[PDB]
Amino acid sequence: GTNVSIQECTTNFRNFLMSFKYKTDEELYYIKQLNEMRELGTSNLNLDARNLLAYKQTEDLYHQLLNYPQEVISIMDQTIKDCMVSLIVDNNLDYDLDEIETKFYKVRPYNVGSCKGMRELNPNDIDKLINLKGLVLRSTPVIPDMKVAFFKCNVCDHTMAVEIDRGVIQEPARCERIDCNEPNSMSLIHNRCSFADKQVIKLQETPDHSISLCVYDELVDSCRAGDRIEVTGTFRSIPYKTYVDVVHVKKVITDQDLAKIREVAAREDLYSLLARSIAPSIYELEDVKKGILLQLFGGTNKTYRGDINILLCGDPSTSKSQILQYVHKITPRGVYTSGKGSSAVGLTAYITRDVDTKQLVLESGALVLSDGGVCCIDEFDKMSDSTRSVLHEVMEQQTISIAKAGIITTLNARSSILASANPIGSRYNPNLPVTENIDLPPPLLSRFDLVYLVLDKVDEKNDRELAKHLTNLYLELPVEFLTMYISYAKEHIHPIITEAAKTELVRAYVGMRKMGTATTRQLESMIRLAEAHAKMKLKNVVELEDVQEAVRLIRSAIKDYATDPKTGKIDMNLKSVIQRKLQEDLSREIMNVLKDQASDSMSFNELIKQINEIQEALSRLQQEDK
Amino acid sequence: SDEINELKEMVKDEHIYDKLVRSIAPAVFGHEAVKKGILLQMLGGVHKSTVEGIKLRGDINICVVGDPSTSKSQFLKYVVGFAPRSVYTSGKASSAAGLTAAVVRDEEGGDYTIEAGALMLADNGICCIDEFDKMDISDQVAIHEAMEQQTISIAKAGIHATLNARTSILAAANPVGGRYNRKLSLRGNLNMTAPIMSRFDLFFVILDDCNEKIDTELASHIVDLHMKPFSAEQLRRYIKYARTFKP
Ligand SMILES: Nc1ncnc2c1ncn2[C@@H]1O[C@H](COP(=O)(O)OP(=O)(O)O)[C@@H](O)[C@H]1O
Ligand SMILES: Nc1ncnc2c1ncn2[C@@H]1O[C@H](COP(=O)(O)OP(=O)(O)O)[C@@H](O)[C@H]1O
Ligand SMILES: [Zn+2]
């Protein structure tokens, strides 16, 4: 039989349509939306199918409906028409009825509860209402589908209107006119018929493999290449290919979670706690932790993306592969690749025409597949030159333009790149300039945001610290909260740079400039990192402290303070006569100031603010009883 | 009458040339020489045919070389976004067949038929090529005939026709060592040979320097970009009138 009782189901949906509320949350939902829908000239209503799970009788309706969506939709069409007629003329609230009266409507539920997954669907689950998710790849051109047949009698020009019922064409046997009774005289005029748009769309599905969906009517060309899509429709296999008849398509936490986020954000050790909890297997490296976490936060996107890219140029025994392999798993899912094991086609795409589609199609590579996410590239120093040439336009415009035989098109590859590269030779050698220690040409090396020189120094004390950190770990914030925080910050905060924060950029860039490799590329980072820091703080604007911290992070990553300005070499060690002179002058000045004021003593904070605009000098003076 | 008046204001004013110079790619600060060059390239010279039948090329080619920091690609993007007909391409992505014309088997028969490459497309327009120095010489050579003869000649697989290639080539490139080796002269910093350099009516090499007064304003404007006379729509209207003159 049928699980849908026409009168019972229409009465139940009438009761739901007039009584639903979510639990200001107290106001009724469709009691408000009915007037708006009567105002609208639209031909369809997107039914909020999450309300079906929020209310009991509608959950029962879903369980009954799982096998018979079409009957309920067909009933709801007439129900919508009747409701419109009533609210217009029976309630005497409106008078525009004729076109609504004559036309046909539909309804599309868009938030139905999900099923058990595509591969788990059984042969009896065919023709059931289903809900799925994935990413769209390809689209077929508009294909007309027959609805009306226009037959003309080839001996008397009489015309008959014939329509298709359940995919059946019925050719009239004889002319219907009283005089003209010639059999088989009816003929079809191809271009006087009526058709409707049908389109096949390819979708890479991920159950809660690729599935080729089918769409009809206004659903065509609403889904295009690269769309992030959730599907509500019918799973189909007919005498047997698997395909989905789409009924609606979607183009796209607790308050306790908000309380937890606020608590973690408010505590003063926020940065320290984040760095400490991101990677337990990697000890210390505060700057590297801050940089990679900032890359995960990302900058603000304006129309000017915020895709921060970081290069690790440490010694070839420091934990760097362990960080990237972990990032590949903790971040929202991306693609893990290696420069040595990649090619230009492997990153960008394979592109070719199609006979059936009559337009270009793409076999997406990892670099384009990472659109909107994060990609990891080990062996960045070993990437082929032709492949490296792709990175240029990717990092400069987030696009890839190709012009070859019969194909001229551009593809978007907006993604963040985290890369590791061993130094030239078996180890980093500070006896050579820092530029000469990296095997990347200046045009590619100069456009990164952060480059980290994670060197290894042999020292018994630090070796003991690391060994005691590691050896006791394998005896015998959670990642869920970390991902929750990362998603929330990207979801909500859009920080704007303040005037004071803007002003310091000029001085910082000029200071980096006057020590001349301080190209204009690093000035992009001087805002990209600042916006990411503001997002991490969850502050709605970029603070001057955020800018100063970003500048400090860049300086520490590059390690300019330990870098020789004359030859680019690095000091190994990073009591001096300049230290002695500074301490002596500071002690003299504070000794003068502490008694120049009309008091025998003063607070040390006020003295520090007066002089710096210290502790060792005052401690030594106290040792001398001054 | 109103259309004529609007187009007339842009022509009958004393300072229109400087106004149009200061209007190409308003996002890119400075670099006024390239702004003049692109403006002149968009209004290429009158084509002439000799009474002997020999034709004189009228389109203007431009090449720009700069350090990896100076914004040389934004000019190419502005041109392809503004030109009525334009094609953008990359030096390494492009190939010989993809620029001039492709010899491909045709439908409805067993004979061959051409397909339009990057140069045949946007004919009577501006073609933009980025990373020009990265191009292989074997596929740089094929651009020469379009650059000087405004034609594409094919003698391959049953096709022996000569095709129109009236296009203005705009290119961007980098010095041989990426950075401008300011120790040496212009002769040693470029890998381009004389035959291809001779075919550019305009040629600019722009550099970077640590001048504080320049870098301060550069930083201010490139930060304003990330913070946020004649409009770009009017320039196409002006060019549609200007291009027809024959001085
Ligand atoms: N700070 C560290 N913490 C944990 N493991 C480390 C650390 N430094 C080195 N290792 C170990 O040394 C090994 C070498 O890894 P790594 O240096 O990242 O790559 P590669 O072997 O290519 O140099 C890894 O197995 C890693 O576990
Ligand atoms: N005068 C300028 N005005 C605004 N932005 C600039 C200027 N000069 C350089 N830039 C910035 O510097 C970057 C330079 O990139 P570019 O040199 O074009 O890369 P490529 O050399 O690969 O073409 C651009 O993204 C641009 O935003
Ligand atoms: Zn008849």
The DSSP code sequence of chain B is -HHHHHHHHTTSSTTHHHHHHTTSSTTS-S-HHHHHHHHHHTTPPPPEE-TTS-EE-----EEEEE-SSS--HHHHHHHHHHSSSEEEEETTT--HHHHSEEEEEPTTSSSEEEEE-TTTTTTTEEEEEESGGGS-HHHHTTHHHHHHTSEEE--BTTB--EEE--EEEEEEE--TTSS--TTS-TTTS----HHHHTT-SEEEEE-----HHHHHHHHHHHHHHHH----HHHHHHHHHHHTT---
Tell me if A386 and B67 make a contact (CB, 8 A cut-off).
no
Give the C-alpha separation, A239 to A237, whole Å: 7
Tell me if A389 and B90 make a contact (CB, 8 A cut-off).
yes
Residue A92 and residue A193 in one domain: no
Residue A87 and residue A152 in one domain: no
Give the C-alpha separation, A132 to A116, whole Å: 10
Give the CA count within 13 Å in the CB-facing half-sphere of A136.
22
The amino acid present at B204, given as its one-letter code, is F
Instruction: Give me the residues paired with residue A153 across strands.
Output: A186
Residue A125 and residue A49 in one domain: no
Residue A108 and residue A162 in one domain: no
* Interface probe, candidates B70, B215, B225, chain A, greatest A C-beta count within 10 A: B215
Which chain A residues are within 8 Å of B68, Cβ to Cβ? Answer: 442-443, 446-447, 519, 521
The amino acid present at A86, given as its one-letter code, is S
Give the C-alpha separation, B45 to A437, whole Å: 51
Residue A21 and residue A129 in one domain: no
Pair B95, A405: CB distance under 8 Å: yes
Tokens of B52: 């002997």
If we measure between CA atoms, which residue out of B197, B198, B179 comes closest to residue B189?
B179
Residue A27 and residue A124 in one domain: no
Pair A234, A211: CB distance under 8 Å: no
B residues 211-230 lying closer than 8 A (beta carbon) to A: 212, 215-216, 218-220, 222-223, 225-228
Name the experimental technique: cryo-EM
Tokens of B21: 């110079």
Q: Residue A73: CB partners within 8 Å, gap ≥ 6?
A: A106, A107, A247
Pair A332, A487: CB distance under 8 Å: yes
CA-nearest residue for atom 10, ligand 2, is B71
User: Is B71 flagged in the annotation as binding?
Assistant: yes
Residue A75 and residue A160 in one domain: no
Residue A15 and residue A31 in one domain: yes
The resolution, in Å, is 3.7
Give the C-alpha separation, B173 to B171, whole Å: 7
Shortest Cα–Cα distance, B90 to chain A (Å): 6
Taking chain B, what is the end-to-end CA distance rounded to the nearest angstrom? Answer: 26
What is the interface size between A and B, counted as CB pairs within 8 Å? 110
Collapsed DSSP state (helix, strand, coil) of residue A590:
helix
Give the C-alpha separation, A79 to A15, whole Å: 13
Ligand nearest the Cα atom of residue A284: 1
Which chain A residues are within 8 Å of B228, Cβ to Cβ? Answer: 302
Shortest Cα–Cα distance, B187 to chain A (Å): 21
Please, is A544 exposed, middle or buried when counting C-beta atoms within 10 Å of its C-beta (0-12, 13-18, 19+)? middle
Residue A24 and residue A132 in one domain: no
Tokens of B242: 């200007």
Pocket lined around ligand 1, Cβ cut-off 6 Å: A 281-283, 316-322, 470
Give the C-alpha separation, A345 to A327, whole Å: 25
Give the C-alpha separation, A228 to A225, whole Å: 9
If we measure between CA atoms, which residue out of B41, B77, B89, B72 comes closest to residue B200?
B41
Tokens of A493: 């905060």
Give the C-alpha separation, B170 to B128, whole Å: 5
If we measure between CA atoms, which residue out of A393, A385, A374, A234 comes closest to residue A307?
A374
Polymer length of chain B: 247
Give the C-alpha separation, A353 to A516, whole Å: 50
**H/E run at residue A39:** helix A30-39
Pair B151, B164: CB distance under 8 Å: yes
Residue A26 and residue A140 in one domain: no
Count other C-beta atoms under 10 Å from residue A608's C-beta.
14
Pair B39, B202: CB distance under 8 Å: no
Give the C-alpha separation, B159 to B115, whole Å: 12
Residue A123 and residue A211 in one domain: yes
Give the C-alpha separation, A226 to A369, whole Å: 10
Residue A119 and residue A100 in one domain: no
Pair B95, B233: CB distance under 8 Å: no
Nearest to A408 among B121, B130, B228 (CB): B121
Phi then psi dihedrals of residue B103, to 5 deg: -90, 110
Domains in chain B (CATH in brackets) are 1-247 (3.40.50.300)
Nearest to B90 among A401, A514, A518 (CB): A401
Dihedral, CA atoms, A372, A373, A377, A383, nearest 10 degrees? -10
Which chain A residues are within 8 Å of B69, Cβ to Cβ? Answer: 446, 519-521
Segments forming the whole domain that contains residue A212: 115-252
| DSSP 8-class letter at A534 | H
If we measure between CA atoms, which residue out of A419, A415, A390 comes closest to residue A306?
A415
**H/E run at residue A83:** helix A69-85
CA-nearest residue for atom 7, ligand 2, is B71
Give the C-alpha separation, A555 to A548, whole Å: 10
Cα B112 to Cα A209, B96, B102, B108, B119: the distances in Å are 40, 18, 10, 11, 20
Write a three-state SS string for B170-195: EEEECCCCCCCCCCCCCCCCCCCCHH
A434: CA distance to ligand 1 center in Å? 23
Pair A532, A543: CB distance under 8 Å: no
Shortest Cα–Cα distance, B147 to chain A (Å): 18
Tell me if B212 and A520 make a contact (CB, 8 A cut-off).
no
